[PDB]
Amino acid sequence: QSIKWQPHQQNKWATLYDANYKELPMLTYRVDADKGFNFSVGDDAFVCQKKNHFQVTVYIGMLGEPKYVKTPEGLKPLDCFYLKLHGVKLEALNQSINIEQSQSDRSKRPFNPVTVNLPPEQVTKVTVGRLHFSETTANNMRKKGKPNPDQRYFMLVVALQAHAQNQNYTLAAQISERIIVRA
């Protein structure tokens, strides 16, 4: 059993256009959490340890060659692609949880969107490892032998972005099921 995903805000995505200003076929997108998440039967939810890093692998099939990003303000020239990860609070979906990446020396840096090169007519694989939620979830402690009635959760958002004239546009995004983060 592994983390399940669904599309996230699919009606709010920008689309990619080729050199002839014709819409490209929708790129394929698959998100998988390789490690860091174990399903806990008692909690009926996935659990991840803050000190134990998690890893996410993404498969992006670039169909055709993209040149423009279809934005709300018209077709704009494509600059580059970004892979962005962040957590959201299950009970406050507008609040984000920062993701940190741990280095060789046990130090951690904020995980900013990573540039990704997507050559045309290929499936590009991107593996993002050594990741950490910057926060723990509230109300993890069990009360009796029962799960905390106010147990909070995070959900992980993995989004491909296109950068066009000093702005980013989500082309595809998946959000995970609920996750408990303990320390």
Q: Are strands 114-116 and 108-110 parallel, antiparallel or unpaired?
A: unpaired
The experimental technique behind this entry is: X-ray
Q: Are strands 99-102 and 179-182 parallel, antiparallel or unpaired?
A: unpaired
Greatest alpha-carbon span in the chain = 64
Question: How far is residue 61 from each of residues 27, 30, 58, 139, 167, measured CA to CA in Å?
Answer: 5, 9, 10, 40, 23
Is residue 164 packed enough to be buried (19+ CB in 10 Å), middle (13-18) or exposed (0-12)? buried
Q: Are 75 and 68 in contact (CB under 8 A)?
A: yes
Q: Are strands 179-182 and 45-49 parallel, antiparallel or unpaired?
A: parallel
CA distance 71 to 64: 19
CA distance 117 to 120: 10
CA distance 146 to 142: 6
CA distance 34 to 29: 16
CA distance 161 to 171: 6
Question: For 116, phi and psi rounded to 5 degrees?
Answer: -135, 130
Long-range contacts from 113-118, C-beta under 8 angstroms, 24+ separation: 113/82, 113/83, 113/84, 113/161, 113/168, 114/82, 114/83, 115/80, 115/81, 115/82, 116/60, 116/81, 116/82, 116/83, 116/160, 117/81, 118/27, 118/60, 118/62, 118/66, 118/81
Q: For residue 72, what are the contacts with CB-CB under 8 A and spacing of at least 6?
A: none
CA distance 37 to 41: 13
Question: For 51, phi and psi rounded to 5 degrees?
Answer: -75, -25
Question: For 152, phi and psi rounded to 5 degrees?
Answer: -100, 160
Question: How far is residue 97 from each of residues 71, 77, 85, 93, 166, measured CA to CA in Å?
Answer: 27, 31, 10, 10, 24
